[PDB]
Amino acid sequence: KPTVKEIKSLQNFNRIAGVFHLLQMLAVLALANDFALPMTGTYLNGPPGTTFSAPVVILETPVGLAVALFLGLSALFHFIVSSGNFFKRYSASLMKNQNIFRWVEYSLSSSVMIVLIAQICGIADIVALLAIFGVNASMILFGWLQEKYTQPKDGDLLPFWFGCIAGIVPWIGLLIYVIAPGSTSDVAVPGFVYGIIISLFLFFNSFALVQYLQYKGKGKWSNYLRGERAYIVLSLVAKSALAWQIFSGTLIPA
């Protein structure tokens, strides 16, 4: 049973994560250049099975603003959950092995992040980016249903496994683009792009491992609160790591 001291400590950690992300959000908004990545349409120039027009730019992702957005969403929800006003709802949810505000935040913030990673890899088709956003959101919503309908140690991981099936799809997409089957150019994928894909792939797998460990509920993971803390650590570090790598790689003259 989660005590009042334990919940209050978790609220404090949420607040700390919020301040880190809010300050990083300010730093990116202030310091970032106007680097932009295109969303494109490559339209038929006749009936299906004929030829295509050249890709056209439909809109440009303002990368600095998009990084600020996933940091800002994190700050907002970490601050909401940390509030004394929310202690009762937070306590009640943790008692039921749930944190719904976590999934609401992740469904938006992690989806912004994987779209930015896709664009940094050169994925530009607007339907590719929309469907990556949608399938990544679906991964999060499956994790939400795992918490809503199961309890740790009840032997039921079906929603979790559905989440893994949805969750892996964007990463298969990235792997296809970095392999670049049929490519004519001899240009290498930049080192900093490999850094982003590999480090954030590891972070995304870490989130899945937290839910798996929580719902297996073996050893120290029998205590749901250990997973709650792990999620805060992973969201703090994953978001800060992606923001810094995008900033360092694309948003400064250096």
Ligand X SMILES: CCCCCCCCCCCCCCCCCCCC
- Position closest to ligand OLC via CB: 191
Distance CA 79, CA 209 (A): 25
Greatest pairwise CA separation for the chain in angstroms: 67
Q: Residue 134: CB partners within 8 Å, gap ≥ 6?
A: none
Contact 107, 140 (CB under 8 A): yes
Does residue 208 interact with ligand RET by CB under 6 A? Answer: yes
Report angle CA 214, 216, 217 to the nearest 5 degrees: 55
Closest separation between CB of residue 157 and ligand X, Å? Answer: 4
Nearest residue to 244 via CA among 71, 35, 39, 34: 71
Task: Specify the DSSP class assigned to residue 152.
Answer: T
Residue 100 interacting entry, from ligand RET, ligand OLC, ligand X, none, C-beta within 5 to 8 Å by type: none
Task: Give the containing element (helix H, strand E) for 56.
Answer: strand 56-62
Minimum CB distance to ligand RET smaller for 2 or for 239: 239
Binding mask 70-109 for ligand OLA (x = CB under 6 A): ---------x--xx--------------------------
Q: Residue 244: CB partners within 8 Å, gap ≥ 6?
A: none
Does residue 154 interact with ligand X by CB under 6 A? Answer: no
Give the total of residues touching ligand OLA (CB under 6 A). Answer: 20
Q: Which of residues 46-105 bind ligand RET (CB under 6 A)?
A: 74
Among 26, 126, 225, 234, binds ligand X (CB under 6 A): 126
Among 168, 189, 225, 234, binds ligand X (CB under 6 A): 168
Give the total of residues touching ligand X (CB under 6 A). Answer: 53
Contact 28, 74 (CB under 8 A): no
Does residue 163 interact with ligand RET by CB under 6 A? Answer: yes
Residue 19 interacting entry, from ligand OLA, ligand X, ligand RET, none, C-beta within 5 to 8 Å by type: ligand X
Minimum CB distance to ligand OLA smaller for 92 or for 202: 202
DSSP string, 93-110: HHHTT--HHHHHHHHHHH
Contact 203, 131 (CB under 8 A): no
Minimum CB distance to ligand RET smaller for 109 or for 250: 109
* Interacting residues toward ligand OLA by CB under 6 A: 15, 58-59, 79, 82-83, 130, 172, 176, 181-182, 191, 194-195, 198-199, 202-203, 206, 237
